[PDB]
Symmetry: D2
């Protein structure tokens, strides 16, 4: 897929499984419109969010529901969610892997961008 | 201050200076109301954003303009900005630290008494 | 494999390719003995370092040569290398994925540990 | 001090207090010679490790006993310790920050004038 998200748990040393996330795309009127959503698999990965045809140029936001994840494990975390906002496909189609590493009071996010 | 933000540059090994950010508070209609902003000092820190009386429980967002920072250094960045969204809950001081790279950022909260 | 290492470049948003690393295992006399070595592929991954039979209980150190990596890209980085030291297989065989995220003055490392 | 270390806890959102560490300098025979050590304060910081005259160019290693820290909190950790190995090169102050999780750590250097 042109967009994949991978989430890891830094407390348990495991993929972060069943983590919900919503993707939005910024509309011409500057509002965030729903684009795609899903949950991470047993591998901590979410594939198949979109297609090369649908994933046009624009500004996208991935909101990862990290708070529900920690809560279900008995932990009250700091962040409401982890947010990743980026311009996609500005110079033609790319594949994007967004990786998030989660701790209760901290998170890291990185992007790997490759040319098809 | 009950809220301080510190920003570091992982490419140059330095404070991230003159980084602009806005702080928003979530309203009843679920929109973001601006309520504080500033830019980081030479030590990469932004102090004096709010007071104890003003900083009531609620959901807050700190939006750090990382894109402009990297653009001024001539480096193309991935993120439009870095956002930190959190609930403040009731003596507490919040220090939000953000470590910046062109294609990655990390943020941590140090919450003390 | 029971041991895999993945290295990413946070400046370029890409896998870190051709990154050398050496693995050592602590000997009975407390010295580090060479165990395995290799370089990351185009995917930023290094597979096939060892086998389940060879990868016995012990304390292992992965030394990732991050300095040579940055130097070849024209950057003088802070760290000599990134080091990952851990006890492996203490409770029976596990699979270990060590992920390192590199910037010139910072690095992060995480482990994903799974039960075969 | 020309060298300061700061350690933070990503699970509890706090300074990592009473974390022991040793600093070594690389010798001509390629062995590590101990030369400073201490444990972090209530602010998670360790100051006074060395002086400008003593802190000459060379390769240094800071070995942070993260395992003992997590063990005292009843949490099983992955790493034996966190090591930061770097060359000091010639006015410079080094601040080494380490952010700790049970299965992950990050370290950054802030090098200033
Ligand atoms: C599959 C791919 C291209 C990236 C996924 O990499 C990982 O499994 C973990 C990446 C990572 C993300 C954040 C970190 O702080 C860190 O040390 C590593
Ligand atoms: C006092 C000074 C110059 C930096 C102190 O650093 C912090 O308060 C937080 C640093 C930090 C924040 C996130 C990280 O992943 C990391 O490795 C370090
Ligand atoms: Ca895919
Ligand atoms: Ca365009
Ligand atoms: Ca493999
Ligand atoms: Ca055993």
């Amino acid at each position: 897929c042109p967009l994949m998200v991978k989430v890891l748990d830094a407390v348990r040393g495991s993929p972060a499984i069943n983590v919900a996330m919503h993707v939005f795309r910024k509309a011409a009127d500057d509002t965030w419109e729903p684009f795609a959503s899903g949950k991470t698999s047993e591998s901590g990965e979410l594939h198949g969010l979109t297609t090369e045809e649908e994933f046009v140029e624009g500004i996208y936001k991935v909101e990862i529901d990290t708070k529900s994840y920690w809560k279900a494990l008995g932990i009250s975390p700091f962040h409401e969610h982890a947010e990743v906002v980026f311009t996609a496909n500005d110079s033609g189609p790319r594949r994007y892997t967004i990786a998030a590493l989660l701790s209760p009071y901290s998170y890291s996010t990185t992007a790997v961008v490759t040319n098809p």
